[PDB]
Amino acid sequence: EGXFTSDVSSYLEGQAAKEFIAWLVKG
Amino acid sequence: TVSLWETVQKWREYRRQCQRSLTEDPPPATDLFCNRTFDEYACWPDGEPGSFVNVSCPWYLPWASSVPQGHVYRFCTAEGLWLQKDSSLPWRDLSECEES
Numbered sequence A: 001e002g003x004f005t006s007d008v009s010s011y012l013e014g015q016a017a018k019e020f021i022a023w024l025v026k027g
Numbered sequence B: 001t002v003s004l005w006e007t008v009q010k011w012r013e014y015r016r017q018c019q020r021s022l023t024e025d026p027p028p029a030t031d032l033f034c035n036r037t038f039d040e041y042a043c044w045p046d047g048e049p050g051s052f053v054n055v056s057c058p059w060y061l062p063w064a065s066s067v068p069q070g071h072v073y074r075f076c077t078a079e080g081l082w083l084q085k086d087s088s089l090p091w092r093d094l095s096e097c098e099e100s
Helices: A005-025 B004-024
Strands: B051-056 B071-076
Touching: A005 B004
Parallel strands: none
Antiparallel strands: B051 B071
16 A cells, blocks of 8 residues: 555645645645 | 646635625624635634634635534634734634644
8 A cells, every 4th residue: 555656646646736725824 | 636726726716706705795793893804715704803703614625525514713802803823914723624
């Protein structure tokens, strides 16, 4: 589990939306 | 996973609904209310003096399905001012809306 390249690439893609939220929150 | 573009689109829709509410919602009962606003994250209505103001977790959140019972909070002081952090930003509790 979480040991494959697609797990990391999917994690990266989801981080973009999460950083957007953090940008909205902190300012 | 929810993409950045999907979240941006839903945030724009949320902002547009907020602006409709800010324009269309009836005036407060008195001038001692804290005034409605959009802080880029949540849409806040008028605040009753001396009371906490609760708003549902913004539905554009990628994990909104994980915090459906959550609320974000502000405090409206007895003088009609949103409580401020000691930062010159309004006090805010987002804990119930954070990712699980």
